[PDB]
Write an enzyme that holds these catalytic residues in place. Structure first.
Site, PDB file in Angstrom:
ATOM      1  N   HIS A 174      84.763  60.429  68.995  1.00  0.00           N
ATOM      2  CA  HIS A 174      85.387  60.594  70.332  1.00  0.00           C
ATOM      3  C   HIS A 174      86.926  60.668  70.230  1.00  0.00           C
ATOM      4  CE1 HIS A 174      85.417  56.065  70.844  1.00  0.00           C
ATOM      5  NE2 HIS A 174      86.480  56.337  71.626  1.00  0.00           N
ATOM      6  N   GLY A 228      93.261  51.610  71.657  1.00  0.00           N
ATOM      7  CA  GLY A 228      93.766  52.072  70.347  1.00  0.00           C
ATOM      8  C   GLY A 228      93.062  51.438  69.155  1.00  0.00           C
ATOM      9  N   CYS A 240      89.867  51.437  68.301  1.00  0.00           N
ATOM     10  CA  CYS A 240      88.698  52.205  67.796  1.00  0.00           C
ATOM     11  C   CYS A 240      89.007  52.716  66.375  1.00  0.00           C
ATOM     12  CB  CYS A 240      88.294  53.342  68.732  1.00  0.00           C
ATOM     13  SG  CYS A 240      87.489  52.792  70.263  1.00  0.00           S
TER      14      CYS A 240
END
Length: 306
Positions: free
Chosen positions: A41, A143, A145
């Site tokens: 993603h 942030g 991820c």
């Protein structure tokens, strides 16, 4: 002596964290050999997250659309592919700080260290368990991820987790390093249910053993019990059923303390039915289930890594 929630030393994984940007979406990647791994993603806008077609979104992306940064240095992307929910970015340069590593998919109730990262930079390290319902209770701000979970054995890093999302309940979901989610979660911004968060019975017993080793044995009662009688009480308290495999795994802690596993089960049962009466165990006012038997042993024998 003393007993603490303890992470692995993070140095080996610090050397692997990079920043990955696609369009105006940024997150963390893991750089091992000449491949960068990140949540797929990274290709999504906020609008995309509501109902993404990852295959269609990917088609509009070339190698040069992926900006991979290691410190002040930009890595050249020579290849890309989607594997399940992770993107693999082939770069022209093998990471020189690549440790010996494995990708492992862990079992519900096993523990790992998280290196929380922002913009490819480490912020901190903490210990998590994969919950029976395949969530983790982490600390993950926007942030975060692509931050990874791992264990170390001497010199080998086993990566077991990559962070992908926060559920509307503020627990955390993510994937192994092959991009398969732990649990039924998907990388889409829709309402998702974790399911019942049961207690890791074998981990609680390991932690009671840790206490006894550290002179905190006030909760030891005069009784014993049976696996079936214990489990009947366990189920009522949303405790995972205890099996003979679990009894076998506590053997060394049984051996060291001279406390039979079923006697400790009766102590545990009495704690569940009576609470703690405002006392503590290893400085906790509830029963801790994020230490494995292996964890407890590892701590009390002082296993080291390099």
């Amino acid at each position: 002596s003393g007993f603490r929630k303890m992470a692995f030393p993070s140095g080996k994984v610090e050397g692997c964290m990079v920043q990955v940007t696609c369009g105006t979406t940024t997150l963390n990647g893991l750089w091992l050999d000449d491949v960068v791994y990140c949540p797929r993603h990274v290709i999504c806008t906020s609008e995309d997250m509501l109902n993404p077609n990852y295959e269609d979104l990917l088609i509009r992306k070339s190698n040069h659309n992926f900006l991979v940064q290691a410190g002040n240095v930009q890595l050249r992307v020579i290849g890309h592919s989607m594997q399940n929910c992770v993107l693999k970015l082939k770069v022209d340069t093998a990471n020189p700080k690549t440790p010996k590593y494995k990708f492992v998919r862990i079992q519900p109730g096993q523990t790992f260290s998280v290196l929380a990262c922002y913009n490819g930079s480490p912020s901190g390290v903490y210990q998590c368990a994969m919950r029976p319902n395949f969530t983790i209770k982490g600390s993950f701000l926007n942030g975060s991820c692509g931050s990874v979970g791992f264990n170390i054995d001497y010199d080998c890093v086993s990566f077991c987790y990559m962070h992908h999302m926060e559920l509307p309940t503020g627990v955390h979901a993510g994937t192994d390093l092959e991009g398969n989610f732990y649990g039924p979660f998907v990388d889409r911004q829709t309402a998702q249910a974790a399911g019942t968060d049961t207690t890791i019975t074998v981990n609680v017993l390991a932690w009671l053993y840790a206490a006894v080793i550290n002179g905190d044995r006030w909760f030891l009662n005069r009784f014993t019990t049976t696996l079936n009688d214990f489990n009947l009480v366990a189920m009522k308290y949303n405790y995972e059923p205890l099996t003979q495999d679990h009894v076998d795994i506590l053997g060394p802690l049984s051996a060291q303390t001279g406390i039979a596993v079923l006697d400790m089960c009766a102590s545990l049962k009495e704690l569940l039915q009576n609470g703690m009466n405002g006392r503590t165990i290893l400085g906790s006012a509830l029963l801790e289930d994020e230490f494995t038997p292996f964890d407890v042993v590892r701590q009390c024998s002082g296993v080291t890594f390099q």
